[PDB]
Write a protein that binds this ligand. Structure first.
Ligand SMILES: CC(=O)CCCNC(=O)CCNC(=O)[C@H](O)C(C)(C)COP(=O)(O)OP(=O)(O)OC[C@H]1O[C@@H](n2cnc3c(N)ncnc32)[C@H](O)[C@@H]1OP(=O)(O)O
Ligand SMILES: CC(=O)CCCNC(=O)CCNC(=O)[C@H](O)C(C)(C)COP(=O)(O)OP(=O)(O)OC[C@H]1O[C@@H](n2cnc3c(N)ncnc32)[C@H](O)[C@@H]1OP(=O)(O)O
Ligand SMILES: [Cl-]
Ligand SMILES: [Cl-]
Ligand SMILES: [Cl-]
Ligand SMILES: [Cl-]
Lengths: 504, 504
């Protein structure tokens, strides 16, 4: 059956190659795409090739690439290989693209996910020349059905001078109706609307993105998969972490600090946070509700089981086996899931109001519980801050999760001082590693250190950490957040110098 | 005229000394008080004395002291001298108390101001034994009229097992009617209420705090001044900074990125942010609206002039001359001002919705525009984060202000790496020193450094900074946020070692 149900628009169908000629050098391009779901695929490949060509003839051919969040090989990958991106925001997981960034060849700024649309509208990324969005279908009145994510697509369609739609036959047609697009002013000129969500399952908008059809400069038919990587097999660490958390939830419930069905749950991108969801699938908690940025395999798992009654997010980020599972029973899942704009899914007003429990991964935390989510050694970008800021600061409870070591034991995930800071102390209440769980609510920094060190640090590093803290207590310039500046970053330096944080 | 208009309650009047005996060792005590306005005065002095007594006889006598924000000499001062405080939150400006904190004798955690009530309700500070609140009057139906601030008083009255009210004759009776107290669920068990503020001057509640009168265990009559210190005479630096900012606003208006009456303005605690307000009093912008946490002298100034039509806040923090000016012309000001609960004034959902422009001071920022608001050398507490987080992250525009140097030139307020981080890069768009102004919107970290260094850094330090950055670019483990970990914190160490950041 036809995907473009509006007949007049079919005359705008042109091939991927011809569509990409619409994109010029220096263009700011806004695309769909969020955690490897629903990013444009064909036009970027075609644009990539034409970019390499222009380079061999010594012509400049680069764009600024603004997305919802991370994309995939067809987009971040291809443009990175073609060296076609002078600026990138706000979130990436592609290796070629990460390397360009860490080599200074692509400029990068990882904005809070929930703020990107608002900043786009303020003009921060400049003027948008292109909105390139993937669609499941085009309705009879010219509405665009998003695919596996909503992200920032509505805002890009609003701002861009020209619009290109990719209709992707690979995407299940029953995705139609799963989205909730608001025509409210969420991220526009203040004063903004109250976004009246008071329930994780509430719909307040409609099932399509709206765009003036005079702007649609091209529609391209496609058939290509969301290349979403599989989720690491949950190991000994994953399980231990899950257990400590589950016990903690259990005790909150018993003390009547949480209800038996907990609160609306957010779980961030990454293997660890996912592995904890798997733990909950089997746990003793039911009537769970998800209010997140992403629906990862584990969350899809709980929807299946029936332990979670509904999940709100901006996209699903599913492994290839889980992606399959859904394209099949789409009939069943379409009623368990609401896909929103990222500026609504990551709206701090809403997150706080629903009182979400925030579960995110981290690179590292220092003994005081300042968190690093992005920059290894303080200078080398991993993925980005994503929505970890949005949720951590807004949440009812902010929880961070990590193996106590990285790189086969050679790095400690608990350090004297974090090399870069994403989440300050005030934004982290709970730490969980495979060693145990630290509850920091109500503690001074010095009390935070005692808990982090005794509960979360790996036994190979606990004494080194304790030694650092004991001596900082005696010699620090102030005693409120004791530090020895001569050695605060020395574990990181030692790793750079010797390949391990352990002494000789 | 009588202040306690409810006759039945006058039988609960007892003296300050007898009232303080209600407070036991180990008690969590919630008090009024926000930026040196409206904190209880008599009961704390009396409690102070009785604490020293119990100490000489070798008896333990300490409390946990939770407030709205900073208080004054009668409270923070007296209890610090008497060594009566085992825990303190969330914000302090008292020297004796600051020293106890920096010596590890009082435990301290500076929570985001707007979050304190919610965390108190969650139980984070423990169970509240005492609510000690200053009042202007008690109405005929037993409502409590707050004084020069609202802060967290409503939440403390709700939670505390016993309540003590101080009715302070010093406070102008015409403060009655100036407050807007909501009976909505702002900071309680989720799901919370939508707080329906859509314009800075909107009232949504009533003029009094509500408490069950069976909880009022004592009322104490008082007559004592809000001891609010004067504001440093604006110097060479203050004026330069004001000018750069004013020009910037002007250019925003011309480019139609701001309206001619700007947006609702927040100015933080401190001399610098205040001095910039003084600049605006005379500037070319009218119909200004304040939505802030505090009303400092400078803001009161603009209200007077008529340049600012109305100002929302949680308290006024006024010098003794400005305090006088208002107790006289209270009739006029009462209609220019709304005083709200700090969890409403610092509500991120509201701040974002109104699209506030956030102007705050800072200790330091590193070349990448990470901000330090609290910890000198990374370990020594100054005041606290206050509401700078609430506003910076929530705002339409986040601006930070500082002299380019501190301690007579011996410290640089722009450093290779901040010694402690309060505000990440994502939360700071504009920097202004006396050297000039840095606009960081849309820039990668590396592009932020070029702007911060060329625009804001003092000429004595600019080459040192440039040198650090040039070499980090070549040798950093990654190139995205270039650092040399061996020297990142070395300027701070050098200052600890030699008393200056300048080389020999
Ligand atoms: C979408 C959204 O915003 C929703 C809201 C929430 N969004 C966010 O939270 C966005 C930001 N978060 C993330 O990007 C993720 O959670 C991060 C912070 C990256 C954690 O990822 P995770 O999948 O949970 O854990 P793990 O597998 O342990 O580490 C992965 C790789 O980081 C290296 N790694 C891990 N720790 C390390 C360390 N201490 N030192 C050096 N390398 C380390 C490690 O080797 C490995 O690197 P390799 O691929 O080279 O082997
Ligand atoms: C309430 C609310 O939240 C509303 C929302 C906003 N809330 C907030 O922003 C709360 C947090 N903000 C603050 O506490 C304030 O703005 C801070 C960050 C403290 C700035 O204060 P300011 O009054 O604007 O400037 P200045 O007078 O230059 O510095 C004061 C003292 O800090 C030292 N100082 C200044 N810079 C220094 C440096 N680089 N190194 C060492 N010392 C330094 C300096 O010597 C002096 O110290 P001294 O008293 O020993 O002389
Ligand atoms: Cl809202
Ligand atoms: Cl806390
Ligand atoms: Cl609200
Ligand atoms: Cl930006």
């Amino acid at each position: 059956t036809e995907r473009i149900r509006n007949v007049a628009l079919r005359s705008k169908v042109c091939p991927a190659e011809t569509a990409s000629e619409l994109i010029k050098h220096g263009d700011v391009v806004g695309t769909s795409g969020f955690t490897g779901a629903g990013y444009p695929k064909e036009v970027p490949k075609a644009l990539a090739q034409r970019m390499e060509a222009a380079h061999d003839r010594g012509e400049k051919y680069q764009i600024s690439l603004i997305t919802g969040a991370s994309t995939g090989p067809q987009l971040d990958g291809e443009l990175a290989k073609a060296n076609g991106v002078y600026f990138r925001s706000p979130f990436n997981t592609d290796a070629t693209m990460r390397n360009r960034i860490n080599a200074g060849e692509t400029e990068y700024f990882d904005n809070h996910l929930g703020q990107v649309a608002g900043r786009a509208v303020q003009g921060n990324y400049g003027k948008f020349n292109i909105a390139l969005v993937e669609a499941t279908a085009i309705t009879e009145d010219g509405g665009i059905v998003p695919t596996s994510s909503v992200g920032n697509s509505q805002t890009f369609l609003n701002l861009a001078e020209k619009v290109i739609i990719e209709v992707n036959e690979w995407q299940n047609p029953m995705l139609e109706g799963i989205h909730d697009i608001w025509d409210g002013n969420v991220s526009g000129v203040p004063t903004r609307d109250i976004v009246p969500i008071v329930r994780a399952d509430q719909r307040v908008g409609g099932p399509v993105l709206r765009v003036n059809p005079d702007k649609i400069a091209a529609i391209v038919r496609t058939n290509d998969r969301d290349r979403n990587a599989p989720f690491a097999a949950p190991d000994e660490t994953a399980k231990a972490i899950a257990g400590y958390l589950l016990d903690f939830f259990g005790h909150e419930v018993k003390q009547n600090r949480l209800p038996p069905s907990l609160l609306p749950l957010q779980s961030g991108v990454g293997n660890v946070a996912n592995a904890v969801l798997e733990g909950l699938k089997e746990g003793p908690f039911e009537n769970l509700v998800g209010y997140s940025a992403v629906i990862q395999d584990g969350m899809l798992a709980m929807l299946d089981s029936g332990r979670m009654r509904i999940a709100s997010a901006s996209s699903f980020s599913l492994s290839p086996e889980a992606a399959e599972e859904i394209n099949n029973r789409m009939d069943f899942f379409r009623s368990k899931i609401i896909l929103r704009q990222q500026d609504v899914s990551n709206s701090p007003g809403i997150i706080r109001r629903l009182g979400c429990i925030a579960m995110n991964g981290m690179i590292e935390a220092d003994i005081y519980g300042n968190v690093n989510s992005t920059r290894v050694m303080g200078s080398k970008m991993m993925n980005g801050i994503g929505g970890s800021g949005d949720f951590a600061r807004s949440s009812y409870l902010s929880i961070f999760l990590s193996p106590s070591t990285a790189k086969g034991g050679k790095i400690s995930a608990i350090v004297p001082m974090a090399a870069h800071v994403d989440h300050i102390m005030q934004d982290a209440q709970i730490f969980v590693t495979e060693q145990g769980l630290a509850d920091l609510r109500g503690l001074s920094p010095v009390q935070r250190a005692r808990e982090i060190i005794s509960k979360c640090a790996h036994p190979d590093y606990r004494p080194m950490l304790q030694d650092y803290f004991d001596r900082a207590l005696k010699n620090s310039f102030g005693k409120h957040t004791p530090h020895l500046l001569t050695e605060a970053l020395s574990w990181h330096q030692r790793f750079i110098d010797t390949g391990t944080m352990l002494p000789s």
